[PDB]
Design a protein around this ligand. Structure first.
Ligand code: GTP
Ligand code: GTP
Lengths: 360, 406
């Protein structure tokens, strides 16, 4: 049994992180998100995965070949010279999925959840049709496309892009199980699968829906990145509670890499993930922030809800609030205030940013 | 024998100083650590032959004013008396109403100083220019920008005799780049025109600029003395910060023991910093340029203080950044809180210095200026107060940006 993963294709959201490393390669709780997907994947038992990449991603080749060695599962590399979208990747690697008539996973990169792979297999064998979708609850139906579910079977009736009608609570969760007849239907053109191909096989009613129980987030967005980091540290608290780091000046669920350093007399608040090699200095308050690797946060700073990029240098008495994403190698000078500042990489900030704007 | 008349205002004149003037009178507000008319009393007591310093205003005598009068009489070895007017009589009506107390003992001349100015106070140069020429009115004037002069009282003079030929208090057009500093030297003869003005009001309230200076200009009675020293007008509450900056620069020559130095068991210090001896500052704090600390102020560890005035009794907790702010009496700022203002100075030489109206607003929007905390204002932990005015005895709970918190 195989699995295709949709990755590359320049995530336009969280763009100050995407400009340096690719979107599946940025670290989500001291681990890349593609690592999360392929580790849970290999816990499922899939012997080889294929990931389909249109952006030329040589460090992705590099890390993925090293992790071919690390994991024990094979990894195949479908290479795309134009953007083929998200159905075109199935049709370019289509003979590798036509090798064996057995249902395959198709996964989106930007989703984090608790991954119920064998329960998905159990459901796809129970309902016995072409395609199975995963769905989830979202409180906000006016943001995402809804999918109507009848009870005790989970069959789709219709698939609706648009909100604001309230025909469903359930939202697509980015996990599909597809048969080879679905890939037989997919064509080479750069069309996306969920705009056209899922609509027609929802019109024939082949498509069925499986429900998660909890903890889902697509983190393609920086505020959704921070919310998914909060939910992942919740799930990590009541799954492996000895992996979160406990201390006297540590509040809530805090994940600290062993290479990270935390200074004296500082209050690391709730839902904080510090990367490898981070130097947190003396008297820094960090709540709800994700500090990626090699970033140094100097003394007496305050940080709430922030994405600090790789090799950053946040100065002294700096206040950062309102999801200000710093890119790679951003040097914030001392005694500044950043609110909403999406800062592009290799920037030096010497002025306060009082309202949300993009710094370039 | 010389005298000095410091025209302090009253409670109506201090309303523009409002969040700081709610507890103490605007003349007794400490700029660079000492109250703002103690600079005038300091400079007048340095003049040889100065017998008396009179303060004319319509404040009622309460405990801060009388305590200041006793402390100034003990410190400067001079009688400092407060003459309270029965009504607000303007800038010249208090001089005319108290003419018998001013001319008592027959002084050679008497200075007239507006209490809201920050100057280097060149009273000896002005006195000697007067002792050479002996005219009724001598004005102190300074050069200003062409755009800024429309805010102040412009003086058109003749450069040979230094005699003002025209005076307009707030002209809509440019008439002169020389502005009135609010420092005057009066002869006893100068109380003779004021009387005539008073009689023209009967056929009480005399404005010295509009009724006396503009009307007698060009007739040989008013003369100008021009200086290049520091000068500022303290009108709003945030102007006192710029006056504090100027006075701390003046302290390098005038009171070098008042500025704070680098001490191995003490805080880091950049620029000119005044710290009161009663104040306890932690050694991890750094106190940046133009910072004044009052008595009994506890400053925690890691506190950044830059371009600020911290009034007496205030507490800054740990890792608190305070920039361009005035922290009121007994007002407490919690840990990791940021009290920030935008620099706004009332200097007549800067072309895009602000136009200094009564309104703090523009198009509904509050203008970005000095953050002012009133007395006994509690700022909670990890909360930003940016460009805001907080009225006294207020306990905040969240961050406020660009507001007036009533
Ligand atoms: N390999 C390939 N991958 C693609 C292409 N277009 C999209 N993808 C992947 O499709 C997956 C899901 O699409 P999206 O959720 O819209 O993510 P995205 O393409 O990164 O776009 P944004 O997240 O909005 O910036 C992502 O993991 C992308 O990497 C492509 O043209 N070539
Ligand atoms: N005794 C007394 N003093 C006053 C009165 N009104 C104002 N003053 C003081 O006189 C000084 C100047 O008063 P303003 O009317 O505001 O004049 P200005 O705007 O400063 O203008 P210039 O003197 O030309 O620089 C200030 O120190 C006031 O406190 C008053 O009615 N009685």
């Amino acid at each position: 049994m195989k699995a295709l993963i949709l990755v590359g294709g320049y995530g336009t959201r969280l763009r100050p992180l995407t400009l340096s490393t690719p979107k599946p390669l940025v670290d989500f709780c001291n681990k890349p998100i593609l690592l999360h997907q392929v580790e849970a994947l290999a816990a499922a038992g899939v012997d080889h995965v294929i990931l389909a990449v249109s952006y030329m991603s040589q460090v992705l080749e590099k890390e993925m070949k090293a992790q071919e060695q690390r994991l024990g599962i094979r990894i195949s590399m479908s290479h795309e010279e134009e953007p083929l979208g998200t159905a075109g990747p199935l049709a370019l690697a289509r003979d590798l999925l036509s090798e064996t008539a057995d249902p395959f996973f198709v996964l989106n990169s930007d989703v984090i959840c608790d991954f119920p792979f064998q329960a998905m297999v159990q459901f796809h064998r129970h309902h016995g049709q072409e395609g199975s979708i995963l769905v989830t609850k979202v409180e906000e139906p006016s943001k995402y496309g809804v999918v109507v579910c009848e009870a005790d079977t989970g069959r789709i009736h219709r698939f609706v892009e648009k909100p604001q009608v309230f025909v469903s609570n359930k939202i697509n969760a980015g996990m599909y199980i597809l048969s080879p007849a679905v890939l037989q239907r997919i064509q080479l053109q750069p069309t996306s699968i969920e705009k056209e191909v899922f609509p027609i096989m929802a019109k024939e009613g082949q498509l069925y829906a499986m429900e998660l129980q909890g903890f889902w987030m697509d983190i393609g967005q920086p505020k959704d990145f921070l919310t998914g980091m909060c939910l992942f540290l919740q799930s990590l608290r009541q799954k492996q509670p000895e992996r979160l780091c406990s201390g006297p000046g540590i509040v809530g669920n805090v994940l600290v890499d062993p290479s990270a350093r935390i200074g004296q007399n500082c209050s690391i608040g709730p839902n904080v993930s510090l990367g490898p090699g981070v130097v947190v200095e003396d008297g820094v308050c960090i709540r709800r922030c994700t500090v990626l690797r090699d970033a140094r946060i100097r003394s007496h700073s305050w940080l709430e809800s922030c994405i600090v990029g790789w090799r950053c240098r946040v100065g002294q008495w700096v206040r950062m609030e309102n999801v200000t994403v710093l890119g790679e190698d951003v040097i914030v000078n001392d005694e500044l205030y950043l609110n909403g500042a999406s800062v592009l990489p290799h920037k030096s900030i010497g002025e306060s940013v009082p309202e949300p704007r993009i710094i370039m | 024998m010389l005298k000095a008349v410091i025209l302090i205002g009253g409670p109506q004149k201090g309303t523009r100083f409002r969040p700081l003037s709610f507890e103490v009178p605007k003349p007794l507000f400490p700029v660079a650590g000492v109250p703002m008319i103690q600079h005038h009393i300091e400079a007048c007591a340095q003049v040889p032959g100065m017998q008396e310093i009179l303060l004319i205003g319509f404040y009622q005598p309460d405990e801060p004013l009388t305590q200041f009068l006793e402390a100034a009489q003990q410190e400067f070895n001079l009688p400092v008396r407060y003459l309270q007017e029965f009504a607000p009589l303007g800038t010249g009506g208090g001089l005319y109403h108290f003419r018998d107390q001013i001319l008592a003992g027959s002084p050679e001349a008497f200075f007239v100083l507006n209490a809201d100015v920050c100057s280097d106070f060149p009273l000896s140069a002005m006195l000697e220019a007067h002792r050479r020429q002996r005219h009724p009115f001598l004005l102190l004037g300074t050069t200003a920008n062409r755009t800024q002069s429309l805010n102040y009282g412009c003086i058109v003079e003749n450069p040979q005799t230094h005699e003002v030929l025209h005076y307009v208090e707030k002209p809509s057009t440019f008439i002169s780049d020389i502005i009135n500093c609010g420092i005057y030297l009066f002869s006893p003869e100068a109380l003779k025109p004021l009387r005539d003005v008073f009689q023209r009001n009967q056929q009480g309230t005399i404005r010295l600029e509009q009724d006396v200076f503009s009307a007698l200009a060009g007739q040989g009675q008013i003369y100008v003395h021009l200086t290049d020293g520091i000068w500022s007008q303290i009108k709003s509450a945030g102007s006192a910060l710029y006056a504090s900056r100027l006075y701390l620069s003046r302290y390098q020559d005038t009171h070098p023991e008042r500025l704070a130095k680098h001490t191995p068991g003490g805080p880091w210090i950049r620029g000119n910093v005044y710290i009161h001896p009663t104040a306890k500052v932690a050694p991890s704090a750094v106190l940046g340029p133009n910072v004044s600390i009052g008595k009994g102020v506890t400053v925690g560890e890691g506190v950044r203080l830059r371009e600020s005035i911290v009034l007496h009794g205030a507490t800054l907790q740990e890792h608190t950044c305070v920039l361009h702010s005035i922290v009121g009496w007994g007002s407490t700022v919690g840990r990791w809180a940021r009290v920030e203002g935008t620099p706004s100075d009332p200097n007549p030489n800067d072309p895009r210095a602000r136009m200094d109206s009564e309104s703090l607003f523009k198009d509904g929007k509050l203008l970005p200026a000095i953050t002012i905390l009133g007395c006994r204002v509690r700022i909670p932990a990890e909360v930003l107060i940016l460009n805001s005015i907080v009225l006294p005895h207020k306990e905040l709970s969240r961050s406020f940006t660009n507001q007036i918190i009533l």
